[PDB]
Every structure is written in C-alpha cells, then in structure tokens.
Amino acid sequence: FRKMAFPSGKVEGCMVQVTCGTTTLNGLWLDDTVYCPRHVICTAEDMLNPNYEDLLIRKSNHSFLVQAGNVQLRVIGHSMQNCLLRLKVDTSNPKTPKYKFVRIQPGQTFSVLACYNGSPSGVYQCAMRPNHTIKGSASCGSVGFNIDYDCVSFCYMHHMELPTGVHAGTDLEGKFYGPFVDRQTAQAAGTDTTITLNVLAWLYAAVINGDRWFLNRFTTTLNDFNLVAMKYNYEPLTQDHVDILGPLSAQTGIAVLDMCAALKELLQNGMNGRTILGSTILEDEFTPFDVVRQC
Amino acid sequence: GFRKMAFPSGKVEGCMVQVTCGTTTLNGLWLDDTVYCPRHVICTAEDMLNPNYEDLLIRKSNHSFLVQAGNVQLRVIGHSMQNCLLRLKVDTSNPKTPKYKFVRIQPGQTFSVLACYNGSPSGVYQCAMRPNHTIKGSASCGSVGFNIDYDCVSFCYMHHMELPTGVHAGTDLEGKFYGPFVDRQTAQAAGTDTTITLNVLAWLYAAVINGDRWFLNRFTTTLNDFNLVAMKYNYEPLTQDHVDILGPLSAQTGIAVLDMCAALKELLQNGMNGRTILGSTILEDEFTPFDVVRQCS
C-alpha cells in the first residue's frame, strides 16, 4: 500500500523563480499573480527583527526578479497579503489549471512539489502533523496541494525551517499553520502526536487487502481506548473521527470500536515480528479519504 | 526528516493512454506515433491459463484495438509484438512526447512509477528494483517506471503481472521481463527478498550530511567480517564495486566505507533503541548513492 503523491504535472507549469536582493526562492504563478513568502525581501540581519511594511516601502517593482523557465516575466505591481507576497505580472499564466485555495485541518494530507530555484525537483506525499509542522527534505515557496477531479487545491507553502529541523508554512492566503511566524527566533512547537484517525484508516486498508491477523475478539469503549492511546503518544480519538470511519466500517465489516480494540492490543504488545501491508511500523499518513481512493 | 521523492510526472502524464481489446482494458505508453502496452490485453480471463500469444494475435486486426488519449480516440494503422509488449501504430504522433530513452536497470536501482487506471494518472511514487526482481504498492497494468534526466525521460519499467503475495512483476520497454516471471496465471516463484546494503549505506551517509551522526563509531570492520553479519540479517553481499561507488559519499563526509559498515553492523546487531535516523526507526533501502547525492547537492 504505497504512499503515492498526486501527479505533479498541473502544478509544474505554475512553478516560478523569485529573486529579491541576495536571496532566491520559489514562487507560485497563477493567472497574472505570483505568490511567494514575504521574507524574500529580507537579508540576513533583517530576519532577526523584520519590519515587513518598512522593508517593502523602499522596494519598487524592479527589485523583484521573476523567471518562468528561461522567460523573464515583467512585474508591474507588488502587494503584501498576510505572510505572502502578491506579485502582479504583465502576463497571465497560460498553464493556469482549475484551482482553489483551501485551508486544511491538522492530520490531513497533501502532496508537495519540492522545487529548487523555480525548477521542480521532486514530488512526495505528506501529512500536516498534529503540531502543525511538516517533516521534510529542507526549498521555500514549495507548495502543497490535493487534486479533486480536475481542480487543484493548493493548501500549503513552505516558509521557514524550525530549529528542530521541521518546516512551518502558510496557506495560500498568508495565514500560518500553528503558532509560527516568519522571523529567525526561538519558536515553541507542540507535541508531535500520532494521527490516530489515520492509523485506523490504514488498518482498515490492511483488512481490505488481506492482512487480518491483528483483529481479535477484544472489545472497548471510546474512553477506554483514549486512556491507552494517550499513554503511547496517540492523539485523542473523538466521536467525529469514528463517524468519519463509518463508511470504511460498513465496507470491511469491522466496527470502529473493535478496530480500536485491535489497535489497543497492537500498541501494548507491539507487532512482535509480524508486518502489516509489508510495513514493520504503524502508518499514519493516509486519511480515510486516501484509503477509499487508493483501493 | 528525509523524503522518498518521486520525479515530477508531467512529462510522463501526457504519454498515458488506455488500450481496449474485447473486455480487457489497461494502460499504454504513447510515444511519437507508437503505443506500447502489455501483450496480455489481447487475452480473456480464460486465455491467461495457457496463452498462445502468437495464435491469439493473428486472430486480431487493427479494428479490434481501441486507443483513447483522454477524451480522444486514436485509430490504429498497424500492430506487432515485441517480446511481452504489444506495439500499436497510430495515425497521429503525440505532440507531448518528451526527449526519451529506453533502459534496462539493475536490481537495487530506484525509479518513479506513475500509477494509472484506464489511461488516467491518479498518483506517482518512488520505488527501488528489489533484488528478487519485484516491485510493490501500485493499484494498474501498463503503468510505467522511469527516471528524469534533466529534459530526458528514461523509461525502465512497465507493470504486467500482480503476484499472489501483493508484489508486482513487469518488463523493460523492449519487452524483456525482470526475473523469471511470465505473462500467465500460474505458480510464479517469487524467492528470497533481501535488503539492499549499498542503498542503506548511502542513506547513512545522507544522515551524516544532514548532521545526524549518533550511529557512528571508531571500530572499523573487514569486508569479510561485515558480509558475514550481513548474510545473517538478510542483507545483500557487499562487493568491491559497491565500495567504489560509495566513493564520493565517503570523501565528502570524511567517513571511510568500512567504518560505515561497522556502524551498520552495530545497528543491525543492537538496534536504534527509540532513537531515529533522519526521522525513521527503520533503515531505509530505497535510496541509491545517486539519489542521495542528487538531493544533497
């Protein structure tokens, strides 16, 4: 049951290079606008206590250098929206796909098109951690997206690498995910818990395929499970979660709480040599939506 | 954090079509005015027990082959069989054809797969070529494997058969299978799978480069003594060629190849113990020395 990102094609044509002063980074070119982190306007010293409005007012259109492949785009306007830079260019992207800007919940998944200086380097699948970080390659301006039907739902953009080695970022409106800001400082990251809803979905996917060895005759309640789960650093399971797993429950024939009683035993005992879907560990980067879709 | 990145899939996306013959429907590769697909598209469920492909192909004409490039049907103007590949010739040449080459990769080497169903891409993933000549984790037949080399696309794989264990078997783009596998429904002997040592060692060098070096030590080992332990923990034997190939990674970190073998020895024998390498509790083996240097430079 492979990870599998989305086909990157439609996003590839939207990836541009933005340079201001001494720093280069990636930008998202949709219609006649380029989006990128606002910290591009900042130098080394600037990033310690940046005043974004002040640093921008002494910058003109000519300061920003945009390049799409080896075509240099002409930037005729510039504005700042939250933590993003909106760069108005003279041309409308001929490769603009059907697109949406969405904000996603922690635990949800998307694909990232990792780019170096505008050129697409690689595509991978990840999940927004419960602590709002993205564990990654270490970039900047690289966007995160899902593809529904013919529409691309851009939901993420990489901004900062935190002292811990994880990556923070914003949505495509400039609002950050989690308590993070765009300045070089100490930044307090929350507990990175396991996405319980995702583990169960993955365990359901195992039942659909062949692996049924972990199922048992044990029974549990919602509170009994959480009490065992939170001991092993698992995110508390809610009634909303079990409802979300409802349609997966009907297909497999295994009631959510029985699956919880299966996970409970798995956490307490470990897997003891055995594998699930060819994996030695429990996987938590597949949503219930990912499981139904990839089966 | 370290990510098993697949190559961008845009260049390959515009090459994906579906082929139909009777009831059977699968994916095909449309490059220039030729379409490549698995030859078992010309087989009914019954046929797959003992398929005489020669006797079944002569039974067909262009008429019987339907090719769909998205919402567009393509009329086929000729057909032939190259090994396990069906080769249909079409009236139009694909305008979205990228600079390409066909290659036969060696076991332990990685590539990207664009999972496709009924000619439509749904996802892309990165995998290695297992020492037992299999791959795992997709979804449909006709889906291709590839590397991206700047502007050129090197196709090296195509899915043909789904083995009973879950694993997949396929051919290169000349139609030659990888391993002893065949396009027919029978036993099909998938043997011992082994960890790719060369790939793990490159991943350990990738860990040092990023800064994570807790696993290191100063107790250098012999090639013989390492290989003895490697066999017991089900790893591929390390050869002098592997040591040569791990050259640049040894030079750049300043850690000798044999010392990293001594590091891996301890990890195999003792484990990580709650500690992680690049964010993993498992030793990864789907990153070639080439992949590491690519993402680290």
From Swiss-Prot, chain B:
Cytoplasmic side of membrane: 1-297
Compartment(s): Host cytoplasm; Host Golgi apparatus
Domain Peptidase C30 residues, every copy: 1-297
Record field: catalytic activity: TSAVLQ-|-SGFRK-NH2 and SGVTFQ-|-GKFKK the two peptides corresponding to the two self-cleavage sites of the SARS 3C-like proteinase are the two most reactive peptide substrates. The enzyme exhibits a strong preference for substrates containing Gln at P1 position and Leu at P2 position
Record: active site: H40, C141
Quaternary structure and interacting proteins, as annotated: Exists as monomer and homodimer. Only the homodimer shows catalytic activity.
Designated name of the protein: 3C-like proteinase nsp5
Taxonomic classification: Viruses, Riboviria, Orthornavirae, Pisuviricota, Pisoniviricetes
